[PDB]
Amino acid sequence: GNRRIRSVGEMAENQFRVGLVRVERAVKERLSLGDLDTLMPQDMINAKPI
Amino acid sequence: KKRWYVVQAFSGFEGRVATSLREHIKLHNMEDLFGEVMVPTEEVVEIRGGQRRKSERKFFPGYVLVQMVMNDASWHLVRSVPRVMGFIGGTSDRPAPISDKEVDAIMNRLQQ
Amino acid sequence: ETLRVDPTNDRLSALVEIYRMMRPGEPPTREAAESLFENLFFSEDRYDLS
RNA sequence: UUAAACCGGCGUGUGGC
DNA sequence: TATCCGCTCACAATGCCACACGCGCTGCTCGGCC
DNA sequence: CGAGCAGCTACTTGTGAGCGGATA
C-alpha cells in the first residue's frame, strides 16, 4: 500500500517533461531578445534536444 | 564606486552569456549600479590570404569582468541569469575586485 | 528545546541561516534568502506533489 | 652493399553456478 | 584547560562464467615552432 | 585550420578514526 508502480507511460512522461523544461528555457532565451514580425514560430523551437 | 568585479561563467557561450547579462541589466534598469561587460577577446588576426581566410578574431580567457559597485541584490542578480559558473574572488561569496593597475592592463589588452 | 537550540529568532535572521544552510554563503540582504525559501517548497514549478 | 628464412578499456542490463 | 560526546568523512562490501548493447551534435574559442 | 570545451540524489550500513565541542 505504501509502494507505487510506474509503467512505461509515467517514466516516458517524466522524460518528456525533462526535455520540455529544457526547450522552454531555450525558447525563453530566444524570446528575450526577439523582435516582432520577423519570423514564424518554427525556429524558436528545436527538435534535437527532446 | 563602480568597481570591476571578475566573474567566470558557463564557457563556450561566453559572449552570449555577456549579452544575456546585459539583457538582465536593462530589464530591471540596473545601469545605475552596473556598467559594461569588457570581454576584450580581441586578438584581431586578419590574414585573409590565399587558401585560408578564417582568422581567429577572439582570444581571451572566459572571464567577462563587469564594472559595477557591488550590492548583495546585485550579486544575486548576476547569479540569477544562467551560465554564471563561478563568481570568483577571495571571500565566502562577497569578493573584492581586481585593482586599477589591472584595469590599465585590460585597457592595454583591448587596444593592443 | 528545538526553539532554544535555534540561534535565530526573527524571520530575517532565520532566513539568513536557512540560506547559509541551503547554499553555503551567498550573503543576501533580505533578497535571496526569502526568494530561495519560497521557491524551494511553495513554487509549483520546483514542487510537483501529484 | 648483396643472397636466403620468419613475422576487452569502461559502463549497463540479463542469466547461470 | 582536560575528557568524554557527538559531527563528519573514508573505506569496504564472494568469486567465477555466459550473453547482449552503446561510448553523441554543433557552435565557439584557443592553440600558434613546418 | 584543427581540436577541445561546452551547451542544449535523496533507504546502505557498519566500522572505524579524526575533528570540533561543551562542560566542568
From Swiss-Prot, chain A:
Transmembrane segments: none
Superkingdom, taxonomy of origin: Bacteria
Coiled coil, from the record: none
Family (UniProt): Belongs to the RNA polymerase beta chain family.
Quaternary organization: The RNAP catalytic core consists of 2 alpha, 1 beta, 1 beta' and 1 omega subunit. When a sigma factor is associated with the core the holoenzyme is formed, which can initiate transcription.
Function noted in UniProt: DNA-dependent RNA polymerase catalyzes the transcription of DNA into RNA using the four ribonucleoside triphosphates as substrates.
Name used for this protein in its record: DNA-directed RNA polymerase subunit beta
Classification of source organism: Bacteria, Pseudomonadati, Pseudomonadota, Gammaproteobacteria, Enterobacterales
Gene name per UniProt: rpoB
